[PDB]
């Protein structure tokens, strides 16, 4: 039951939920809410979305 990391924003995957969507080359992405998966669906490019832990380390917010 070890916790995973979300593949869109960066979170803590607890057993029970998650989406894969794969790619074809088997990158194996894991999401945590419908919001994150839906945001990935239209290629929102999580290099620009704001409220992100990925942004929390990239944009140097809350260090």
């Amino acid at each position: 039951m070890k916790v995973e990391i979300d593949s869109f924003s960066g979170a803590k995957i607890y057993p029970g939920r998650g989406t894969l969507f794969v790619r074809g080359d088997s990158k194996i992405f894991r999401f945590q809410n419908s919001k994150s998966a839906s945001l990935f669906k239209q290629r929102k490019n999580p290099r620009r979305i704001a409220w992100t832990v990925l942004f929390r380390k990239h944009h140097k917010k809350g260090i």
Partner: protein, 386 residues
């Protein structure tokens, strides 16, 4: 003419009529067979359904795909405060059936149970069981004759019990009254146990234990008037049909010139007392100690209650029981648990359960964090906290 394409019938022919129950608390119609060799104990308990969470257990069954491996399932938690015995009922056996011989009650009656006999408590004069308490003044001889009568006659003896409702988050203030039947020992032993427990409370640990088969009785949730499509599950009419499509196209034939009772018809769905068989107890918790939601593998200091408490019910502070699968009835609905009548040995009942992980996340949406410490650690400093 014969049916063009035969199909299985819709709905059950053993659950009619689908009508409202006579009381909010579903009554029990069967009790475990009495064996006068075991020590006397209760065969049923009362509890209010609180909610369900997610737990992780071990899949231990030879022949399965994975052995000694993790798995997830749903488990319903019911808040069952310890019950207080207020009397016993002696049932004599007659050729026409069981008959109630006599009833004996306690000297001191709590306000919660006494409120059950009143419909307007504030306007009432609280003159309930007043002259009855005078029977115990001199030596209590007013019931010793009745006690001897219950000892001699009334081969079937059952104990009348009530719950303490001031310890639950529900703002109801009226104890629910049900009937509990004694199994084990002789009639004299059962009545002695009943009389020695007068004005006393008993814990749920003495009536239920881990790794047993437990059945649940409760009334379901009503939904009002509903057409046949969801009440029974019949095929809806096509779009091109006239005067609507959500009904039964044919309800019978010319002969007989009446509508068949087995024909699905629009009516009431829900709020029916229902019986759930083979529910497995996973763990029984105590309300007087912490680590309710902490297991041996996961020693995180947390309680069974999720973030912000259970939805529409509140928090858990008394004894709670979590059982595999869904329980009939919605939250805050009274559920009276009943032990398994038949000794199901088989293989699905002898396994040993070992809880690993307890989900205490926010069920009020899509919460992730389990404990405030984890949320603070992953969240850092805030603006609200100075």
């Amino acid at each position: 003419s014969h049916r063009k394409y035969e199909a299985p019938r819709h709905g059950h022919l053993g659950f009619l009529p689908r009508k409202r129950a006579a009381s909010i608390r579903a009554r029990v119609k069967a009790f475990p067979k009495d064996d006068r060799s075991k020590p006397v104990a209760l065969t049923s308990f009362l509890g209010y359904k609180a909610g369900m969470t997610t737990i992780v257990r071990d899949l231990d069954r030879p022949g399965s795909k994975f052995h000694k491996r993790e798995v997830v399932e749903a488990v319903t938690v019911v808040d069952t405060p310890p019950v207080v015995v207020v009397g016993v009922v002696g049932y004599v056996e007659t050729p026409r059936g069981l008959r109630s011989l006599t009833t004996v009650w306690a000297e001191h009656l709590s306000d919660e149970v006494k409120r059950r006999f009143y419909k307007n408590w504030y306007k009432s004069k609280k003159k309930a069981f007043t002259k009855y308490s005078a029977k115990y003044a001199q030596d209590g001889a007013g019931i010793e004759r009745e006690l001897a009568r219950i000892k001699k006659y009334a081969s079937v003896v059952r104990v009348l019990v009530h719950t303490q409702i001031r310890k639950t988050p529900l703002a109801q203030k009226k104890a629910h009254l049900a009937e509990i039947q004694l199994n084990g020992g002789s009639i004299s032993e059962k009545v002695d146990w009943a009389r020695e427990h007068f004005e006393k409370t008993v814990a749920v640990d003495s009536v239920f234990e881990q790794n047993e088969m437990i059945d649940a009785i409760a009334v379901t949730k009503g939904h009002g008037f509903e057409g046949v499509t969801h009440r029974w599950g019949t095929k809806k009419l096509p779009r091109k049909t006239h005067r609507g499509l959500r009904k039964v196209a044919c309800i019978g034939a010319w002969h007989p010139a009446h509508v068949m009772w087995s024909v699905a018809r629009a009516g009431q769905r829900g709020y029916h007392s229902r019986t759930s068989i083979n529910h497995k107890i996973y763990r029984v918790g105590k309300g007087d100690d912490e680590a309710n939601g902490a297991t041996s593998f996961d020693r995180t200091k947390k309680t069974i209650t999720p973030m912000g408490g259970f939805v529409h019910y509140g928090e858990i502070k008394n004894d709670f029981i979590m059982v595999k699968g869904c329980i009939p009835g919605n939250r805050k609905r009274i559920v009276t648990l009943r032990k398994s009548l038949y000794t199901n040995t088989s293989r699905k009942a002898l396994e040993e359960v070992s809880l690993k992980w307890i989900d205490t996340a926010s069920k009020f949406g899509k919460g992730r964090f389990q404990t405030p410490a984890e949320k603070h650690a992953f969240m850092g400093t805030l603006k609200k906290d100075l």
